[PDB]
Symmetry: C2
Amino acid sequence: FEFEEKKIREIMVPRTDMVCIYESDSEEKILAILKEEGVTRYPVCRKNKDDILGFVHIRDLYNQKINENKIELEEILRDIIYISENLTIDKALERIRKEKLQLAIVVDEYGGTSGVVTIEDILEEIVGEI
Amino acid sequence: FEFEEKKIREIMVPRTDMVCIYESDSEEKILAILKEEGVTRYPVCRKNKDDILGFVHIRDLYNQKINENKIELEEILRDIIYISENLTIDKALERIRKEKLQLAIVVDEYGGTSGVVTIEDILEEIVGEI
């Protein structure tokens, strides 16, 4: 019940803690962050965290590097959806479920990135209330 | 180069640290461990960690519970492969890549479970050496 009134803002990884791979990051930096972080899907940014280009999956990154000794982000870049931070957790699931994606960029009232949230984060929260 | 002589034993989650969902676990216990552990794919065991039935993915578990208020493991159970702990990391990748799976149960010289290893664990190790 509590997740019908509860906003996505409450369970997102906030902008400051979100890890973006920037298109200009070195390959060394990318592997260093994939290794430290325990995470499978990374948003890719141009310049700043408000210009999201899409996301990438860790397996794709590693297969590029292993097979060719070069990471080409554009060739493995996968689409994201944007949702408002005032969307309730249940309508978020409905939405992301409908679009067939696992990852949402969460957007503030000024059209900036306020954070990021995963389909699992959202299911984890809902099954909580049941 | 070092991963051509290096065994899977060296990068597996060992038996003792591996988390198995047992077929007889309560639903409460399952959600409690999915929540604490930061992990997407869980082996399912009957009785002990040497009788692996397959594995399950966290999204499937959560969708069962949310949609029906009941977890039925058999209906979401996905196949695993077994590899020897003396397989080298490169032949492990070849093997798991060939079978189209993301998760291997690693087996000792007595036919027991010595641990578990993921495709990402293995790519993470290989790109290390390059």
